[PDB]
Design a protein around this ligand. Sequence first.
Ligand SMILES: [Mg+2]
Ligand SMILES: [Zn+2]
Ligand SMILES: [Zn+2]
Ligand SMILES: [Zn+2]
Lengths: 160, 264, 114, 180, 65, 773, 196, 43, 49, 133
Amino acid sequence: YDRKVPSPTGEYVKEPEWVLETDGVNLSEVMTVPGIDPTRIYTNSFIDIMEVLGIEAGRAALYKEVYNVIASDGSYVNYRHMALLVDVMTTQGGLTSVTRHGFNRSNTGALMRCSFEETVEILFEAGASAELDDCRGVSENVILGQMAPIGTGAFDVMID
Amino acid sequence: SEEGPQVKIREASKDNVDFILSNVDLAMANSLRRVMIAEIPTLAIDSVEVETNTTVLADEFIAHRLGLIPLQSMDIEQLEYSRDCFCEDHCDKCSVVLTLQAFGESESTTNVYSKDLVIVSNLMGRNIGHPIIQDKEGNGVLICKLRKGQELKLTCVAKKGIAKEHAKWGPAAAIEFEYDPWNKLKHTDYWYEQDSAKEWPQSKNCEYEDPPNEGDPFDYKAQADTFYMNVESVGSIPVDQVVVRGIDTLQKKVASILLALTQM
Amino acid sequence: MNAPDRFELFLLGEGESKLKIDPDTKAPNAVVITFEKEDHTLGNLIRAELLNDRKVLFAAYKVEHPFFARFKLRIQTTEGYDPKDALKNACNSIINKLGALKTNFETEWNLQTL
Amino acid sequence: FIVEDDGHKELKVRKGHIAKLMATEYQDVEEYTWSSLLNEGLVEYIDAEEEESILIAMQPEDLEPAELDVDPAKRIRVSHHATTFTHCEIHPSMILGVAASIIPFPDHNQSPRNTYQSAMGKQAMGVFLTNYNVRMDTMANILYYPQKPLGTTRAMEYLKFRELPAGQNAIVAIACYSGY
Amino acid sequence: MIVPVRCFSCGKVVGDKWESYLNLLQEDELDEGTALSRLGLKRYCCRRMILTHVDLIEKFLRYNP
Amino acid sequence: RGNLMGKRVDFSARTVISGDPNLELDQVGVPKSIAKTLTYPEVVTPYNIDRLTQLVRNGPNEHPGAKYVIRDSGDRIDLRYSKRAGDIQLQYGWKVERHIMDNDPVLFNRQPSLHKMSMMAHRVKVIPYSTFRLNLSVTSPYNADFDGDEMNLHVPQSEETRAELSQLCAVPLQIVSPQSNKPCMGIVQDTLCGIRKLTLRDTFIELDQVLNMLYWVPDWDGVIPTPAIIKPKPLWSGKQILSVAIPNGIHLQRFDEGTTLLSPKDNGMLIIDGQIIFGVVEKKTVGSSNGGLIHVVTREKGPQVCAKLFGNIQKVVNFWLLHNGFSTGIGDTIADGPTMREITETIAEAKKKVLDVTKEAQANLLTAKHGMTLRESFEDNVVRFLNEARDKAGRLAEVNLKDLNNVKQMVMAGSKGSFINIAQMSACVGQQSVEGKRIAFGFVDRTLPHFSKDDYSPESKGFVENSYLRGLTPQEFFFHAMGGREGLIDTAVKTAETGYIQRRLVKALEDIMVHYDNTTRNSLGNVIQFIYGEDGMDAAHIEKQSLDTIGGSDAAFEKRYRVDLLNTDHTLDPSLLESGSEILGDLKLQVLLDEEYKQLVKDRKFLREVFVDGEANWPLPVNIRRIIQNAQQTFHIDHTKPSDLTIKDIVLGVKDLQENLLVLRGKNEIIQNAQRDAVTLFCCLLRSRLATRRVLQEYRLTKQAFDWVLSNIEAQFLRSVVHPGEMVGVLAAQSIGEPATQMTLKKVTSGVPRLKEILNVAKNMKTPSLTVY
Amino acid sequence: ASRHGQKGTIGITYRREDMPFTAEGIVPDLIINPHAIPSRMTVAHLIECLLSKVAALSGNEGDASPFTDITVEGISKLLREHGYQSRGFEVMYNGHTGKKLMAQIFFGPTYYQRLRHMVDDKIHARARGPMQVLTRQPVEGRSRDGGLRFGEMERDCMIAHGAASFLKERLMEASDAFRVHICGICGLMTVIAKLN
Amino acid sequence: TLSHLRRTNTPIAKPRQLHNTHWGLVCPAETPEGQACGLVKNL
Amino acid sequence: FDMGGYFIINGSEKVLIAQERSAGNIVQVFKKAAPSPISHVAEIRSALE
Amino acid sequence: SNTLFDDIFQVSEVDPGRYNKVCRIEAASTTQDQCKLTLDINVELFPVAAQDSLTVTIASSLTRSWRPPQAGDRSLADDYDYVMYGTAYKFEEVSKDLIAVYYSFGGLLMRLEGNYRNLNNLKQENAYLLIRR
RNA sequence: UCGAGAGGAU
Ligand SMILES: [Mg+2]
Ligand SMILES: [Zn+2]
Ligand SMILES: [Zn+2]
Ligand SMILES: [Zn+2]
């Protein structure tokens, strides 16, 4: 791997470094090894980094793996878009997946949750667990046909 | 002889006229062929009422074919536009009625040529409405074919119109147009693989211009004044009057601008 | 279906004038003439002949849309010279060449033998 | 086709059998048809399982022996480097479908483009049958003046595309002109 | 399905040369290239009207109604 | 999700699309029958009753007219058939459902709706014919083609609804996209092909063509520019006439490969005050790119000037290209006779380099590379050997493509072209691939029954020596057809997965919006980000600009920023400042520069901690580079007169400015610390460029100009801030689902399979690895 | 469309005068654009235009069979016999002006196919039309004078814009706004509808 | 009409891809797009 | 030029489409997956001709 | 409002930079050894052979529309066969007591390097160039 | 109204 790194004069110059590439994954026994740098070693398995190096180390490992997908196709997306998506998966404390048995098992209302997948089964449990909906979700007000809190709808307007 | 554009006819015929349009501006040569093709008024069929059609062809197939049949249009100025005349639908001052009847009374395949068109309305003594026959056998244009037991009865109304509205009123087929066959004007950049000169054929009009000397530099600030033209005519109007009525239709089109400027 | 009737290329519609003249804004001696029901057949011969008149500073036409048949013409002339008079002499300069062409061709045609 | 020894490995079908085939095509006296080719042992019916064990030839000139100057513009065809033939292909264009054999020069094209045309040559307009006037079916579109194409496949004759075309030889100029 | 009266590209009347064109190939034993040149068709826009034409009218006649 | 989350609606339309160069950008072609069908309820006022009474009198069958009229009772009145259709007295307060007319706001749709920029408002321009007309440059935000594509249209029925299309959802507002922080609309395919041929130095235009080109610009001032050449023939360059489209106050600088300030290759772009100075206009100048003309003009002059600018470039260049002309023959694929000799030689020497490797493998003299089998090393070598033949022979052809070659000219301008297409059309199409490898042994030990068994040669495995010009052989035709099936499968497989991916992302983040404290939240109120995007700026008003504190030697960093009043040799020369001689020594002022220099040194350490790669080019909300160029031209500064700024003006002024850049406005310190944390990188940029040596020496500003830059930077900052109410997660979803849709084509999981692993968190991954340092 | 996957709708109908012409008066029936050539690599389209052009002049048929030994260089030997550029270029003149086009135009006949998709068979527009019985929503399809779907895929796009009142308009006033009455004790629409 | 009578269907481990065995019997190119590409083939 | 090969039901001419299927009465060896208790199968689809 | 610079140059190199009607010209001032210029010229109108000697002038006149000459009464300020109109985009110093001025005559580029033009060649938009036989 | 097939789009 080629790498630019500061010279004593201060300008960046390229210092080539030898980097091993493996076919497998076990972080708990690989980083605890003499002769490596255990401060910068990396896997392309963010799920292993989350349980080993802490959740917040997995968040940056999650975002970098999204970036390598985009930049391999040559495209460019701004930072905040992917980093919003990464933080939503990461905020719940583990690795919340964007799937029907992932984020959609949250407490984020019912009519919002019933609009994605497993539609009728959610209303069944909500009829049992007697859930009350805040109706501040976008999909609650779309289903009820109201002006949702969407920009224009975030505020009320009244006279002096 | 008159001061202005000079014309020298190289070749001429009943259908083709080859001349050189010397000492003219470019826009006059191009507005000529634009007004030659479209704005000349000429007569062709614009309405068809079908009595009986036992043919295989649909009526509007045949109605499309009848419009493109070339009719005589020499004394066309004595004819009037239907939108101009005061008749109810059409009259003899504006329109020329035609009539076609055909029956298959032969075991052989019976053709329906254009020369079988017959004229009903009064011509008022002008060269108007006669379908052109250039066929060496004399049979005009193969409109339809008939088996035994088939008939076709219809009435064609030929009205006056302009080729901008529909191409059936087309006086001329295709206008040859070349200026500067050596490209001494450098009006185009030649595409080539090895040599521009050997990959492109010399025009026939290259003989009637001075071959340039490559040691001589670019003759800049020269403009296109000499044009080479060749006019085909369908036959509705003779070739000599296609261009002359083209000049007149353009000159009349300039004239309507003058009268509009005075009225304001 | 949606296409207009094909005579609108050369027939003036309801309440339409042939020439509508408007003066140009932010130009001393300039005018805009909205030729109706006309095209590049007519406009290029006007513009190319205006350029031959040595008292014309600007002369150009454009077609706003190939759908419709109309074009705008802009002329710029020296002070004390209405471009309508520069237009009038230019169009009249055209017809003299056209009428000379008509008789020159008819003279040369009847000389030819076929 | 069928290849065996002779005096060497050569096709069974000869020019004498070919002339009697075209003698049958003139008469449209000891007729010669495709079954006569099959029953004289000159042609075999080879399926996918049985062609696992055979060595086919692409062109009948691969069998001619070999021993320089050549036209540079043609395709680069590899010398086949094979001798022990059992069969020979009738013609390599006979791998194509009925719709793909409409396409001119498919060997000079990208293979998705050959596929893309084959889906919409079925939706071109034309005369599907001569009795369109007689039939009364739910929907029918017939071209006014259909034209046989100026560039025809050799396998167009057996598809009757020249006899029942679906388009017109439009005069096509590729040109950047008015940006429409 | 029947001979176009005029060429699409240039508008020359090609609707009269059909009966002549067929008999040029047969009664004179000509080829198609010299046949089109004889009939006054010289531009290729004209030539593809007659050459590429499939006269389907002859099959339409055989249907007796 | 079929009747509530989305339902069929009236006041809608649908037809084909076609492209109109003489349409404006935000204008839409609407057929009359569509406008005769669609209505808008308009209440009668004193202002409109003279028009509306005529419209009702005009009738519904021909437009402009009206179809229904509503009284105060609410009982509708049918104008298609009634007695009083010609006898109407419009009392005030009545509702008249008129037709759609010119310059009305309507939505423009394209399915699939992968974008917020795929549903943009349009100004109605009613046209006669039956197709929706749209501008050339609006294709890419819809992925529009004209090969039979169709587009929808929706009509608002109330004034607030009309306002939201015009002031939020309009075409000019969505020109710069929050996705990719760049414009989405650029010059396409004809203008783009023409604007290079226009801008060539050989390309010169005469007076007759130039005057028509001038009047084609709509908002033109009426001033003929003085020609480039005047003596033999007054002649204009294409750069002369094209520059009239670019508005005054536009500066643009760009450098690439051979870019001197004389530019012998005519490359690069230098644009000053609405005139281009040298260059060739092409895709890197005028395409929808980061830091292009569309990026400058939309920021500088606004959206409406740039939307009007889109047409004005088209109307000139299409006029030039209409009269210049352009085509593509098949001689644009023919290479030299000698070039074909070396190309088939290039194939042959690589064909023998496989046979030498194969014979080496056949005698078991092959050395097995580490980690991989002996057979896998043979496949890896030969695939690499033959691609190098395909890549070189194609690059042998692009050498031989002359300057007049029309395929080359599209590659040159970036309209529609690539190198590989030249390699396949002229030199050698290459080797086909199925499932990542060569053509498999479907038959026993052979690919086709015309080869002997166990033939691992290039011909019997998928390599296609002949080109599309030369003609593919029968065996090559099938392998090319075999690999093409996987692509049409791969094209059809990914789009269902991608369409699932986009829907999963949107419904995950649909409640995500910036609330009224810059905190990203959801309906429950669970905070996801405290500052949106970790700095608090909308991704639209964001540009890439280098922080040159990072790069360069410490001594070179020193010379550009160290000012020692106490030294005689490293001090502001009295040429630079009126107070130059009186400032020397002055112990109370060198403490301010040393405080400045100690912070710029601390800043360089700070960014070097974060930016380990050292690439300073990173996007930041305010383009200071364009601001300073404005002050150099708005105030006609010379590079000889000394400044009006004492050192106390600069150093105290910049430090006062950072307090006035605002993101959060709380009165407690942990918000103020978050506010300090929000702007911290921008100040590191701001102090780097507004430094006391750099202000006085590199761009010799004055006191009047300097106070304006502080007013510009503060105002541009507060503009470039997220507006509370923006649903950003929905935008975040589509900003990744749409580039996922354009994902299509040394073994690792990459792209859409890897993306399917990342989102749907994979217990077992198809290719895990450890990158060991 | 043509026989090589080259689709395309009609952008404009120009007359013969507006169309560019050559020195023989020949005028293209059809004008396509050169940028659809290199992206999709349809060289057979380009040879068909050449082989048809030599077939029209010579009066002989065109052999476009696959796996022939016919070359472009072999065809272009024949077209130079008939007095044109070997690779099909023709000096063409503008119709509007009459100036020779600076780029010589690739010109020739090419078999084209009129596909079955017509605009007036696809033109569709609707306002306040029929309603479905079950859902009180607009009916499906243009064949029943139906309404276009404002799908959930489109609902996300108006959410990202922030157009909230347009979202309420597109979902109530268009397509099945309905008023119903509910009780304050039991939150259900059990109440007897009593209005007048 | 000619190409309907030679159409095949496969009611549904890599079936959709073109096999070497398809040489001579199934058209390599003629197939639909999208929905069932390679499942529905022509002879 | 009509080719036949179609039935005529209720005036609407119908085409029986071909139906691809694996051949019966052949022995095939199928390597099973790695998380499987059994590793290889020999399948024979047995039906009378 | 008059002549700013005058010199006489002998051309060293003429280079058609992949161009047909423009060449890159290279010359130095005769009677001087610390001044040289590099300029883009139109060879189609004015053929510039190598090792020719060309008098070169720069003016400031002789805003508003460019009207055509219209007559000989509008008297040209050029006894030359070639002229051009351009804009100065940058001025750089090679060294102390040295200078270099950059002009763009509508994409046609000139570089003038020397010392003694210090009384002229200012930063203003207006600039001409006159070249004799 | 429900179920089936066929294309059009990316
Ligand atoms: Mg499309
Ligand atoms: Zn009358
Ligand atoms: Zn013709
Ligand atoms: Zn209750």
